[PDB]
Amino acid sequence: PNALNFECETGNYHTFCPISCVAWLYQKIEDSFFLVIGTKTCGYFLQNAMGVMIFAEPRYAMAELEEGDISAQLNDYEELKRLCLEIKRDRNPSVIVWIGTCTTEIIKMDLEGLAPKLEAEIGIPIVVARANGLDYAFTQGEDTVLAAMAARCPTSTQYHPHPPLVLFGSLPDPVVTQLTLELKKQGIKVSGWLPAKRYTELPVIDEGYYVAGVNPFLSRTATTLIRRRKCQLITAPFPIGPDGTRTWIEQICATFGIQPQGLAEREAETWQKLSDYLELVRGKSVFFMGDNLLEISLARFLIRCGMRVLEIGIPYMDKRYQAAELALLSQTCAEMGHPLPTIVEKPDNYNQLQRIKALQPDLVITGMAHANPLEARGISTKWSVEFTFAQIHGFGNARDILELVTRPLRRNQALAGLGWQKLVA
Amino acid sequence: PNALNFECETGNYHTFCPISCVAWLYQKIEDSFFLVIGTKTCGYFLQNAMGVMIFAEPRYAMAELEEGDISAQLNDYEELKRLCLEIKRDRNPSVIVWIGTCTTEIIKMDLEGLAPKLEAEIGIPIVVARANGLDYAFTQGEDTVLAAMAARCPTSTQYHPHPPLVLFGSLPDPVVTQLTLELKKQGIKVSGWLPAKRYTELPVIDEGYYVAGVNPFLSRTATTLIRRRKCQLITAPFPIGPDGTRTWIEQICATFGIQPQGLAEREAETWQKLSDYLELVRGKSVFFMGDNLLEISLARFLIRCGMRVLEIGIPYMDKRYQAAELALLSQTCAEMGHPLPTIVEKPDNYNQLQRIKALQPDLVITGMAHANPLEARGISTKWSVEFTFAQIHGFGNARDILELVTRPLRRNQALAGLGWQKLVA
Amino acid sequence: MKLAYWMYAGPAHIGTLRIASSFKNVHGIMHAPLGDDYFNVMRSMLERERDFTPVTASIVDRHVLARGSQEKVVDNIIRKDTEEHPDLIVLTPTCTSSILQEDLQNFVRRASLSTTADVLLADVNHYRVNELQAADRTLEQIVQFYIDKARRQGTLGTSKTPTPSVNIIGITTLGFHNQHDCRELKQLMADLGIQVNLVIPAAATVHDLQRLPQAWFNLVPYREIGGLTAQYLEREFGQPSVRITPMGVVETARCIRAIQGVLNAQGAGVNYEAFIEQQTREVSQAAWFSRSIDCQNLTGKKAVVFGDNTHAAAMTKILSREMGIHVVWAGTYCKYDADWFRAEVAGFCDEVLITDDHTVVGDAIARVEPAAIFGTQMERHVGKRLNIPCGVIAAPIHIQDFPVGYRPFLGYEGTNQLVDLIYNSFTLGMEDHLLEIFGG
Amino acid sequence: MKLAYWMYAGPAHIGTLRIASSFKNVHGIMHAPLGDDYFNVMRSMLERERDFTPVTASIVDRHVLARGSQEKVVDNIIRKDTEEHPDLIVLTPTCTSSILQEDLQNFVRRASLSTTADVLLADVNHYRVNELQAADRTLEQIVQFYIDKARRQGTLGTSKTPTPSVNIIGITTLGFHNQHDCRELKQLMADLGIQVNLVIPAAATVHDLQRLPQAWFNLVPYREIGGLTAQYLEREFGQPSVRITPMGVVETARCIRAIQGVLNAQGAGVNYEAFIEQQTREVSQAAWFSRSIDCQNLTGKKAVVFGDNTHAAAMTKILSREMGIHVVWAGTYCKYDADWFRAEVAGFCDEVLITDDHTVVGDAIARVEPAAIFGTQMERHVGKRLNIPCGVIAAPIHIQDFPVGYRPFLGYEGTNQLVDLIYNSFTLGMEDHLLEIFGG
Numbered sequence A, B: 001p002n003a004l005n006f007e008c009e010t011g012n013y014h015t016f017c018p019i020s021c022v023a024w025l026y027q028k029i030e031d032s033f034f035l036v037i038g039t040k041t042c043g044y045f046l047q048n049a050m051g052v053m054i055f056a057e058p059r060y061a062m063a064e065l066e067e068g069d070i071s072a073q074l075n076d077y078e079e080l081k082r083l084c085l086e087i088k089r090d091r092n093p094s095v096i097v098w099i100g101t102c103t104t105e106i107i108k109m110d111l112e113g114l115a116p117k118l119e120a121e122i123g124i125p126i127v128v129a130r131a132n133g134l135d136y137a138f139t140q141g142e143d144t145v146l147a148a149m150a151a152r153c154p155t156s157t158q159y160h161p162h163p164p165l166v167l168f169g170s171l172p173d174p175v176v177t178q179l180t181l182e183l184k185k186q187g188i189k190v191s192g193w194l195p196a197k198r199y200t201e202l203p204v205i206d207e208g209y210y211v212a213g214v215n216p217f218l219s220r221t222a223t224t225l226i227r228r229r230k231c232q233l234i235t236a237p238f239p240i241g242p243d244g245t246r247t248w249i250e251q252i253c254a255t256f257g258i259q260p261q262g263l264a265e266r267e268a269e270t271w272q273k274l275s276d277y278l279e280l281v282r283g284k285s286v287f288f289m290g291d292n293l294l295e296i297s298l299a300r301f302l303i304r305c306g307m308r309v310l311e312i313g314i315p316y317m318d319k320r321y322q323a324a325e326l327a328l329l330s331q332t333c334a335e336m337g338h339p340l341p342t343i344v345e346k347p348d349n350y351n352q353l354q355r356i357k358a359l360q361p362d363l364v365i366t367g368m369a370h371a372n373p374l375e376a377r378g379i380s381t382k383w384s385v386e387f388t389f390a391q392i393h394g395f396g397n398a399r400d401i402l403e404l405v406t407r408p409l410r411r412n413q414a415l416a417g418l419g420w421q422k423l424v425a
Numbered sequence C, D: 001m002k003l004a005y006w007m008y009a010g011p012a013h014i015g016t017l018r019i020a021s022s023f024k025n026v027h028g029i030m031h032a033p034l035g036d037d038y039f040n041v042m043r044s045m046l047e048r049e050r051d052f053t054p055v056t057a058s059i060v061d062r063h064v065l066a067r068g069s070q071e072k073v074v075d076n077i078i079r080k081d082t083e084e085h086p087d088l089i090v091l092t093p094t095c096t097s098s099i100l101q102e103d104l105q106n107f108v109r110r111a112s113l114s115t116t117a118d119v120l121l122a123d124v125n126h127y128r129v130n131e132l133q134a135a136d137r138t139l140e141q142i143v144q145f146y147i148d149k150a151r152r153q154g155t156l157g158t159s160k161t162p163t164p165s166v167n168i169i170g171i172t173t174l175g176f177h178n179q180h181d182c183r184e185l186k187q188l189m190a191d192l193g194i195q196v197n198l199v200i201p202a203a204a205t206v207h208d209l210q211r212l213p214q215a216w217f218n219l220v221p222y223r224e225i226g227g228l229t230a231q232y233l234e235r236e237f238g239q240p241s242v243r244i245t246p247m248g249v250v251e252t253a254r255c256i257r258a259i260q261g262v263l264n265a266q267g268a269g270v271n272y273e274a275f276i277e278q279q280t281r282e283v284s285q286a287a288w289f290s291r292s293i294d295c296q297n298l299t300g301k302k303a304v305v306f307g308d309n310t311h312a313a314a315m316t317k318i319l320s321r322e323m324g325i326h327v328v329w330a331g332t333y334c335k336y337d338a339d340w341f342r343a344e345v346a347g348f349c350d351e352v353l354i355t356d357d358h359t360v361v362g363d364a365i366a367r368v369e370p371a372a373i374f375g376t377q378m379e380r381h382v383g384k385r386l387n388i389p390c391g392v393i394a395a396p397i398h399i400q401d402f403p404v405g406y407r408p409f410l411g412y413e414g415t416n417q418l419v420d421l422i423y424n425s426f427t428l429g430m431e432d433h434l435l436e437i438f439g440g
């Protein structure tokens, strides 16, 4: 009867530049090539953030700008031509994706303008995604790539009647199969997915189709599907956790006027198989320093699991796009008699470390910048990025989420009775 | 006009137990299996001496004797049966070779008697080779295996006329090909080789055939071919070095009444390609502590190369078998105006270290037991065992011999002008 | 515009941060968009740091293009001043800071009026220098600044210590085996009877700096960081320096002889020669290794070497001069200091490779087919693709390249470590070739 | 009769030779056929020894079966006496010596009448003991003998040192990282304020032995060698012993507490507790590693451990108790001391494996599919066949397992080395799985 509380801080926090989306998206779109137009600053980030994948001949490179590029002593269109040609020679990609960068913004480089021209001359589709640290955080990178992709989707030219549904959000193939085959049990067809395995497989999207988000950070992509493609958006909580997954399905079926057949049981069965992780998770506190936009829906899951969430930090909050996920959180807070947590947008990591110090939470969810300094101070931590690449969607993956959240809890058990938890310099 | 001098010491010296011959012979006879009947003492030697090959699932194992075997509380024939059967199950070999050992001698185990019986019961040939430290040194192991093999060789049942020639001595296939094709240029057929690639390929050997040794330690095998098989032995120097190789061929051809066509040139060409190793080797002194029976023929090669040999140490000297090789040495000493060296049979390593200390040779050829202690004393050393497994036979391999002998000489060059050569504890 | 995905040396700002992070109570603040703070991730991961990395970002968002990026910078400086109370705060230009061209020098002038902390702007420019040059300059800049404060306040301790003593200059955070090199260096000084006056950047306090001129001389172990500072102290104080990286047996001996000359020149009356003999025979095993049959088996074997100036030049001379190895080519990615490299390695390899393109290095490994590679993590990965062992000798390094086991590269124990590293890479590849040759 | 080709522990004579080779001026002479002298090859290769190995063979040839093997033995003893002038010569029975059954005890009785050197026959029997038990016994035998000489000559120094002091017993030639463990142990004693009275076998002289009772107590770092000797000194002198292998953080702390009790029991008045806190936080990084995110990523990962009693038991407790690893099974090849092992590891692995058959160990690795293996060279080779990383923790070791770089396993620096060894094996296998998962 008193609702969630939303706050907003300085935006001074740690998170991965959105250009990181090249790392999983090139892995996802098999015939793509991601060219990031940027500096050595950007190159250094990706070389280090993508760890071992940088030694797997990735389909990614920096177009590293010289001083001559900044002053226009070198012609930008000519520069892009010479090296987009190198790419076509050595990789024969089916799409080149340009990642616009802070530098390209500040010096105003008309990528959106140069692309359609260069495309024609060269034979290859060029997709521009202005995914920079000026404007966006981490997983928001994928949102700016997928919005841009949505414009490239072709047009029109046992299941129930329902109109074409197309889902959007890059996920590992095993998790597509699992989710697609989850709706197949309800008699819902997945006409396609926005990013498919190959750029050449982008789904048809005609005026009248339905779309649904599978990840919380896909605002722009959703906005685009509605406005530019003319689709109906099923707003629903995201299938992260078994509560998430069932609500997600129930809401799809409801949009289509279907009674969800046989899944109260499918949920309980999933929860039952988590008895041992729930014993550990029960009663303990969590603190989400925000960084990847999964936080509203992980918090909501972890409250149903029996945890106390002390703060939900978030880079950016789309109340329109998350709407249903936010409704499920508040309702979950009521059903578990948990006081409504506060959602901190654009948080101040510094301040947050003071709050953590005051609260002594059992679990801080956070970046590698703060984890070891925290552990050394006796605060247990779980590094947040792993949530973005572990499989966490659908019924079969609720275990995975908990393996993640309990990991530091298990290491605590295994190492108990050895007085050195708080050992700083 | 005054000949070689032969001496004989205490037999107190380092060398590899003859059971080491399993290591290269199992590698050579592809379908064989070598069972060494011995103790943990023997096992420890082989496990360590065969270095990396012990991790390649060798076709070799110890039949390790218990206290019950020594006292005959366990029946030897029954013991051998149970485990020769294990071997047949897991490897399906075409011959099992028993290596008699010191222990088997001292406790008088009738391997030669038990073998023909066990063979019949089990379906597989069993070859006994009494190759022990009581009686033999290092490469003499192969001689005792090959003598035993000679008894198993089947009987009768463009080239020149000549009667069947069969060569004996295990060599790497590439060196067989090279030597066989060396005689093929003289119009000499190699009817077979005693050890072939497979036990199933042992050559025919009928009364009247000719045989020739390719390695200096094959006495017993030669004696056997003459006496038990009824063959004519071409005594000749061994084709180690290009002088060796030409003499070896000249002597084969001579036995058959053939003029060796076009090889004065083939020799000079080989020598010319060794200019750079000969510059290094010229004038320097060598000391062979004996250990593998190659020593008479390496010394002879190295004297023609321009070195001063100060001592030829040898485990065992068969003047009958080496005869021609010994004749070539003395003649080589005369042609190079080198005083006839003395050949020390059954040397005393201790005494030898006193002589080395007195002589300060440029090169001591020797075992790993003495090498590092010598180096640390400023004496350069070449480890002798490498001569047994490097390819050193024929024209194409004279380079290999020199790479070996000069190696410590080259390291001397590369490390000159750094005052620490004599740095003992 | 160049197409690349790998770089051996990072953006300029990395060097300034590494300098700021090596002192105590020095806080770097970076004028940069959201996300350029990955330096903190790297510090905390690779060095497994128990303390927060004292580097904050004055954020550049769009509201910056509009006279932004010049008001938060003052606010963020003062806020950092009050929350963390540093001795020194260092404003840190990035690639973005570079193309907005705002009067950063001014904010620093302004901000230092409202802060207890001293304030500097790193005299460093993205488009002209890399990580290493930036770090070299920043370290000089801070020394000079605090030398200057001492002078104008009358506190400049200007009298040399009674007994010979030294400043060790250039030990750095995220520096390849630096913490261990530092311990190895203090131990050597102690064995030589030389008091250690001060160790800089690493763990030094800004207030110590004025004691610098009290050293009889300065030792600079790494080619790439500290040269600038050693030179300034020479011209201001007549403070001589020894810049011979004691890395390997022959070079360690040089370093120590040089120290000998420089101290006797000011009256020390010291001969180290017996110390060098005794360490070379007794403490280092490397001389003995060179004579041993193990090393004899390596003569003439082919290697390639690639890394930074210090380690690739020292490695190249250890391979050739101390172990009889055939170094087909040795190279460095320190292009801006290429001439020094070519001179250091002349007569120790057949060919010199100067590049910072990993694909040129890779192709040069495939064409030569060495028996072993000594290089960076990227050369290690080429070795894996080509089935060739690799010993890692220089940065771009991973967590396994920050051991907690004692692994200096410098000094007499450092010689012991290099033997193992070298013998192990050669022997791993031989043992592999033999396995396959025999069975599997 | 058993069929095998691999053995974890060598013939009995190896232990006696290792004991003889660890003292100075002690010459082992082996009653053995030509070829049993491979021990010298092994010593010289693995330890890269600058000195000849003081082990000779009184040869057994056929002329021995004929009352041989009992006349050269006297001649060879005296000749060795005069050429090398040892303090002690040790006659050494082999497997051959074992089945000829000659009065060796007699020749020793005879030979010692004609030699300046003392003479013993190793009280060791091929068919009853292995390398390790033999070495344990031989070391006791020599201590007792020279304790006895001291007594009968009146030179037995029987008064305890003024300040607490210790005998370090069990450091051996060809012992896994023994030379480094020894240095690590003397350093710990020195930091604890404990004089080191004597270190035995390694580098000790037989004439020192009589000073043994002057120690307040004895430290025995390895389960397998020195127990016998520590026990004899307890019963003869009331000399207490601490037999807790300081290997790992928790066990190092135990060892040091035990030393604390034993010394205060004789009036030392010492508390080490602040020393343990200070080393555990500051010098060892292992406690900090356990809390770090690096270690957190290992929780629940599966390992298997196999080796000798000391290292496999210590490794097993480091993995479980200090790093949250799941040790599916831990095993040892010291069958004759299996009960000690089972007790040491109870509650630290799911299952205990006692065997000395490498194929049983191999099959037990394949069935469990751990993420990492800690074992001998043979377990390392199983890892290669199965694509699983392996850290080598115990003998059958190769040259790469005798580093000249400082690598103790014991003590506080030893904890640092074990972290790297462990984190590196886990991370190498993860990084490999990821490479393949991504491309190649």
Ligand code: SF4
Binding pocket: A017, A018, A019, A038, A039, A041, A042, A043, A045, A101, A102, A103, A131, A132, A133, A134, C033, C034, C035, C036
């Ligand atoms: S924030 Fe901008 S400058 Fe920094 S890495 Fe990201 S794109 Fe490049």
Ligand code: SF4
Binding pocket: B017, B018, B019, B038, B039, B041, B042, B043, B045, B101, B102, B103, B131, B132, B133, B134, D033, D034, D035, D036
């Ligand atoms: S000499 Fe005899 S006892 Fe020794 S290893 Fe050889 S066979 Fe076995």
